[PDB]
């Protein structure tokens, strides 16, 4: 459990800072493409846990095409890992195809739930 709004804040802090971002972005992408989920044909959004109710709320708003593609990717990953194999460099997710299709819904749901729970337990102090 860790709020995605804090992640977005740190990300925007890093992205507009020249020297630190220039130092940390090549190691960042090198870590991403050495992680290994790229080979299994997985997008990043398919990996983050989908159990606590806020993630379920985010999932329920996805257009049907994305949900179908996600289900296929999960099934194919399960089948591929069952045989301990890896399909060759044809199903491999390309470098720029790992775009987050699920971040905006997560951020909107985070903001809505956070302000709901903040204003629910509120005081009338000036």
């Amino acid at each position: 459990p860790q709020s995605f709004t804090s992640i977005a804040r740190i990300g925007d802090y890093i992205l507009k800072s020249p020297v630190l971002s220039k130092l940390c972005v090549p190691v960042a992408n090198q870590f991403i493409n050495l992680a290994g989920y790229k080979k299994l044909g997985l997008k990043f959004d398919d990996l983050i846990a989908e159990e606590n109710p806020i993630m379920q709320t985010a999932l329920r708003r996805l257009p049907e095409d994305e949900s179908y593609a996600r289900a296929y990717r999960i099934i194919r990953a399960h089948q591929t890992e069952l045989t301990h194999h890896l399909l060759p460099r044809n199903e491999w997710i390309k470098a720029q195809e790992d775009v987050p299709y699920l971040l905006p819904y997560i951020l909107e749901a985070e903001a809505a739930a956070k302000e709901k729970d903040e204003l629910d337990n509120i005081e009338v102090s000036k």
Partner: protein, 248 residues
């Protein structure tokens, strides 16, 4: 810790009873019994095992009964309540000169003699440990070490001094052959007999273990084949994704 009293490890010797497909050399246990009883009689107790396991592996039918008749075992009192003396049975336990324990500590000029029925596993190492302890001690302590008056030395044994009287002189065993009168033969005999007494099931244990490992290896290979068989229809199924038509 400090190796001075930690005890240097004895090298792994080669025995007749250290291996996967072996038995006790119980053609010498009939000799180990004699070597034990001739010298260690009034030295230790060993009083833990019975004579029902001493028949068929070290003595055949009769000498065990001769030994039973040889000694008195303090029978039940008669109708007058007076004590008596009786021959021993074939289901009794190996006796000892001490009544129960009192006569031991009085004559040892020091400590008590540990029960040899379990000394084989009572120390680290094992079969070779007792051999090294009874062989490696010199007749003279290392230079600069003045032992307490009346105590001997043993570098292998952690402690560097024992109340053991070094009764290991040769030339007075001579069963019926030329085998005795050298320390190695009697040392091997005593260590094999002590190992047998500590575990009088080695042959049966190894036979049952061989049968068990054979049957479990067969069962394991069988399970391998069947698991690879009935999972073949699920480890090969292929999925094809056709995107649906764009209409909710």
């Amino acid at each position: 810790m400090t190796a001075a009293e930690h005890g240097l490890h004895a090298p792994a010797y080669a025995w007749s009873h250290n291996g996967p497909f072996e038995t006790f050399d119980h053609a010498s246990i009939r000799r180990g019994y004699q070597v034990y009883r001739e010298v260690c009689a009034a030295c230790h107790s060993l009083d833990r095992v019975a004579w029902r396991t001493l028949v068929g592996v070290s003595h055949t039918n009769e000498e065990v009964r001769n030994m039973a008749e040889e000694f008195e075992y303090d029978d039940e009192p008669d109708e007058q309540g007076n004590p008596k003396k009786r021959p021993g049975k074939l289901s009794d336990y190996i006796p000892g000169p001490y009544p129960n324990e009192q006569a031991a500590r009085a004559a040892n000029q020091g400590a008590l003699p540990p029960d040899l029925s379990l000394i084989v596993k009572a120390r680290h190492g094992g079969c070779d440990y007792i051999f090294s302890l009874l062989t490696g001690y010199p007749d003279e302590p290392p230079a600069g070490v003045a032992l307490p008056p009346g105590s001997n030395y043993n570098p292998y044994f952690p402690g560097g001094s024992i109340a053991m009287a070094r009764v290991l002189f040769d030339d007075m065993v001579e069963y019926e052959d030329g085998t005795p009168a050298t320390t190695s033969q009697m040392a091997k005999d005593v260590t094999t007999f002590l190992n047998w007494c500590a575990e009088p099931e080695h042959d049966e244990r190894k036979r049952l273990g061989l049968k068990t490992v054979i049957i479990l290896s067969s069962l394991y290979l069988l399970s391998i084949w069947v698991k690879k068989f009935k999972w073949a229809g699920i480890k090969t199924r292929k999925f094809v994704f056709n995107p649906p038509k764009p209409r909710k």
